[PDB]
């Protein structure tokens, strides 16, 4: 029943200011993506679900180095609105490795797309498969 | 078949010492609320479910700044009794925000009541829409 | 019918390079687990899927101090290979209580190994019943 994905990150760093079009990420591996269910579309990172349903969506980035902001932000986006946001606060002036996880569940219509959104800032990202990763479970259906 | 909840933080900032009872958080949206299995009780803050199960349950909770302590924590309480707690560092004398994610499966009986605790500790939390929520998955019947 | 299991952390502090083998954390509670999905070695740490299908991993892990080296980092390994990593760079000085969690969806064999690995380094962690936790749950069948 439930069909699942787990998109790592690859290719080296993401410097987001000069590296992301209005900071979604979009460079992911996609080894599991139950393709039933989940559609990633790579130019724009966007993964759309292609059946309504129930689905715990989850997303984990490793923020390495920040310039001069002590905040490092992203946005899960649903359709380009806001679900959750992860901030954490890290000095800048050196290499802080810190992973950053946000999760959470909503009922989703067939089409719509999910994606990571950075808030634009003079960050760095690690896009090592591990530390840096997008998935979701479609758990069933929705009520109704 | 999954039945879920999603709630999100809906007002302004939070002086955990002067604004809350107990330190628990109780100005919850419900965006999702499955009603069959879920109850909010808007008052004291408590999540109660309504038919036995296993429950994943989750929370996000935005802390903001701190004073006279360093140490920002909550826990995610189950008839008072704690069963998961989050714990961050975060530097005194300035804003600095930090959303603190924690989550874990569990077995509940009906009526149960699940709640998140803030430390009593003079913690201001930004109770957002995205950056503070709590949420909970009924993945289906319990064990014997 | 899902499956879970929740392990609690057992004992009191413990020092990393001088506690475990290979940064492996063993000291393992078991509340709710099914024993014909999920089998805990105690020994090593391991706790094991006896079926194939989907599971979500998850875990958290308290440090609270690091000496040295600035960095403190674990992985959640399937079989000693990586799945997941988590990590949170904290002050080398001084006491700082961080929950460290992380979490994701896979397909596993039966006979598979899951684990939390430390990195091997002066890393502090508390043991603690509600801040240092692992979890698994078996969302359903794998494809195939």
Redesign the interface.
Known sequence: ??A???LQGQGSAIQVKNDLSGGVLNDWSRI?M?PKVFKLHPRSGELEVLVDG?Y?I?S?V?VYYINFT??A?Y?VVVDEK?????????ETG??????C???????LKARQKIAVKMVHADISINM?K??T?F?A?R???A?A
């Not at 806001?82 to 890290?90: A, E, G, K, V």
């Not at 996880?101 to 009922?107: E, F, P, Q, R, W």
Request: some cysteine.
């Open positions: 029943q439930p699942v994905v787990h599991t139950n129930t715990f989850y984990q490793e002590d905040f932000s946005e806001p679900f959750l946001q992860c901030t954490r606060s890290i050196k290499t802080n490795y810190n992973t996880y946000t999760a959470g569940v909503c009922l090592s591990h530390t990763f998935g479970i758990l069933g259906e009520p």
